Design an enzyme around this catalytic site. Structure first.
Site, PDB file in Angstrom:
ATOM      1  N   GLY A  18      33.352 143.076  30.947  1.00 28.11           N
ATOM      2  CA  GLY A  18      32.524 142.814  29.782  1.00 28.11           C
ATOM      3  C   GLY A  18      31.481 141.701  29.935  1.00 28.11           C
ATOM      4  O   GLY A  18      30.297 141.979  30.053  1.00 28.11           O
ATOM      5  N   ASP A  19      31.909 140.437  29.938  1.00 31.74           N
ATOM      6  CA  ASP A  19      30.979 139.303  29.948  1.00 31.74           C
ATOM      7  C   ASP A  19      30.723 138.673  31.324  1.00 31.74           C
ATOM      8  O   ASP A  19      29.932 137.747  31.452  1.00 31.74           O
ATOM      9  CB  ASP A  19      31.481 138.220  28.990  1.00 31.74           C
ATOM     10  CG  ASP A  19      31.219 138.558  27.537  1.00 31.74           C
ATOM     11  OD1 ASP A  19      30.316 139.367  27.264  1.00 31.74           O
ATOM     12  OD2 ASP A  19      31.913 138.014  26.657  1.00 31.74           O
TER      13      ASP A  19
HETATM   14 CA   LIG Z   1      30.525 138.962  24.612  1.00 35.24          CA
HETATM   15 CA   LIG Z   2      28.441 143.600  29.451  1.00 38.97          CA
END
Ligand SMILES: [Ca+2]
Ligand SMILES: [Ca+2]
Length: 298
Positions: A18-19
DNA sequence: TTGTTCTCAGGTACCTCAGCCAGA
DNA sequence: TCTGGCTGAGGTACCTGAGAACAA
């Protein structure tokens, strides 16, 4: 060499998908034997308001550091031995950034050779190329051409990707025909560049419910049906680290819909729960709030 | 009277690079 | 000549809303 707990690695692999960021660079460098220096870095970015999370990592991984950039912070690991040890253990659980991981491990092992030959060096730089091709690369200057001079396992991982690229949203939607002129709306969403839609498709299969929607250059997995949603959040909530409050708030709301559609009191109180969810989120374009619904006094 | 589907969009919060320096 | 800590920013790829319309 630290061995990392599997459950730690499952969640983290999701948040990293994700991040996170897995990066390889060729640094122009005069001192360097071949006028170039290779850097390998693992990054996890997050709003500074949640730097505690990145501070946790430093402690759990046991190496690396955290930096600020005004509003946004980052965990960074560039130290070579530990990076290889960590990525070696994390990559089996990666789904989006697994090829990058592995390429960075290859580069790391072939280093000693790369530094003892112009030709070995070049080849290694073509792996940096590849990694950049895999990433959403957009501002890269120095390239190699330049150098030519099990259900718990899924829920742990899914909690990670959701805490990073996901969103638990609750809305109050203005509507005339509604008894109290407003309609409650709960939504589970995951967002992703449309070129990785195949991943949000996989979710629909694995979760059992929901749909993938396209718009502009991105796609969403969305889940809004009150039952399935309550079921899903009940399962997923124990494994969340950033969005656990929001998940419960949504469950508490769903359980009190019955009594909310009965009295103007319960309805306005449930609206304050929606307010809390948005407070918890990074809310920025919200219009209809509970105070708004307090025009029900009319 | 309510739930839900389907698309759009504001404003970032990420991602993914760029680079300089001190120490060994 | 090599390595690791530290700093700045370009340009999205997200998050987290919004609302019109379909289906009861
Ligand atoms: Ca995020
Ligand atoms: Ca992403």
């Amino acid at each position: 060499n630290t061995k990392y707990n599997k459950e730690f690695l499952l969640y983290l692999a999701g948040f990293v998908d994700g991040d996170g960021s897995i990066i390889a660079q060729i640094n122009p460098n005069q001192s360097s034997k071949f006028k170039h220096r290779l850097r390998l870095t693992f990054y996890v970015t997050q709003k500074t308001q949640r730097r505690w999370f990145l501070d946790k990592l430093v402690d759990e991984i046991g190496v690396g550091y955290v930096r600020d950039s005004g509003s946004v912070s980052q965990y960074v690991l560039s130290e070579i031995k530990p990076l290889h040890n960590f990525l070696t253990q994390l990559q089996p659980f990666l789904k989006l950034k697994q090829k990058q991981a592995n390429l960075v491990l290859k580069i790391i092992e072939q280093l000693p050779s790369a530094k003892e030959s112009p030709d070995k060096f070049l080849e290694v730089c073509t792996w940096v190329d590849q990694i950049a091709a895999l990433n959403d690369s957009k501002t890269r200057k120095t390239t190699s051409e330049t150098v030519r001079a099990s259900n718990k396992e899924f829920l742990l991982y899914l909690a990670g990707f959701v805490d990073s690229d996901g969103s638990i949203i609750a809305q109050i939607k203005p509507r005339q025909s509604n008894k109290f002129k407003h309609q409650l709306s709960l939504t589970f969403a995951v967002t992703q560049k449309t070129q990785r839609r195949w991943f949000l498709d996989k979710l629909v299969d694995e979760i059992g419910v929901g749909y993938v929607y396209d718009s502009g250059s991105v796609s969403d997995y969305r889940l809004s049906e009150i039952k399935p949603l309550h079921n899903f959040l009940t399962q997923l909530q124990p494994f969340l680290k950033l969005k656990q409050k929001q998940a419960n708030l949504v469950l508490k709301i769903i359980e009190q819909l019955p009594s909310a559609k009965e009295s103007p009191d319960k309805f306005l109180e449930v609206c304050t729960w929606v307010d809390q969810i948005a407070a918890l989120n990074d809310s920025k374009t919200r219009k209809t709030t509970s105070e708004t619904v307090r025009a029900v006094l009319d």
